[PDB]
Write a protein that binds this ligand. Structure first.
Ligand SMILES: CCOP(=O)(COc1ccc(C[C@H](NC(=O)O[C@H]2CO[C@H]3OCC[C@H]32)[C@H](O)CN(C[C@@H](C)CC)S(=O)(=O)c2ccc(OC)cc2)cc1)OCC
Lengths: 99, 99
């Protein structure tokens, strides 16, 4: 689809068999989701944002369906203010910016 | 034009007679620019993201040119690592997400 930006670009995602709302975020290198239970092993990681760094759990090769489009990639889980879909997954679904 | 998301979507902007590089950020409600001594009145504000909140100076009705497309709106100035073009200006240049 084509998504305008008058409102936040929120979409429904499916991860770990659960539906959630997430923000399509071209300013994010990586995908960061709010605290959640995901199966498989994970590595502690740190990522920095506008207000400093947070500790996240890194899950690799995780399936996630974004607005009907499948992706398999790295998902960071931690105390983010909102679920954000970053460029590592936006590229997988073929998302571009156009003006 | 169309911008893929393999790399950060960095473009040249023009503000107050000055060229700068800025990130087209669909995840940013507002526009946040590196410390700059813009003229005129302003209002203190705090914006939050990953890591917490930062203090910024809100300037209103500021003209910015983004890839030859003009836009006028609120700009937040503060200690941000990168110039961030948010939805308040992206809408004015006709920017959409497409997949
Ligand atoms: C050289 C030093 O760089 P640093 O690492 C940090 O540099 C960056 C800092 C921020 C960004 C942009 C933000 N991206 C981000 O957080 O992405 C994380 C995950 O993926 C990584 O990739 C880049 C960073 C990591 C995001 O797009 C937009 N944000 C809101 C999101 C969170 C939804 C609520 S918001 O900016 O906070 C913001 C809030 C309110 C506003 O208006 C009211 C306007 C903007 C990109 C690079 O330094 C560490 C101290």
């Amino acid at each position: 689809p084509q998504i305008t930006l008058w409102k936040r670009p929120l979409v429904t995602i499916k991860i770990g068999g659960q539906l959630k709302e997430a923000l399509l975020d071209t300013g994010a290198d990586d995908t960061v989701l709010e605290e959640m239970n995901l199966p498989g092993r994970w590595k502690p990681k740190m990522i920095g944002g506008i207000g400093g760094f947070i500790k996240v759990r890194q899950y690799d090769q995780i399936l996630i369906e974004i607005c009907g489009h499948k992706a398999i990639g790295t998902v960071l889980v931690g105390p983010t203010p909102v679920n954000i879909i970053g460029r590592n997954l936006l590229t997988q679904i073929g998302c571009t910016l156009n003006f």
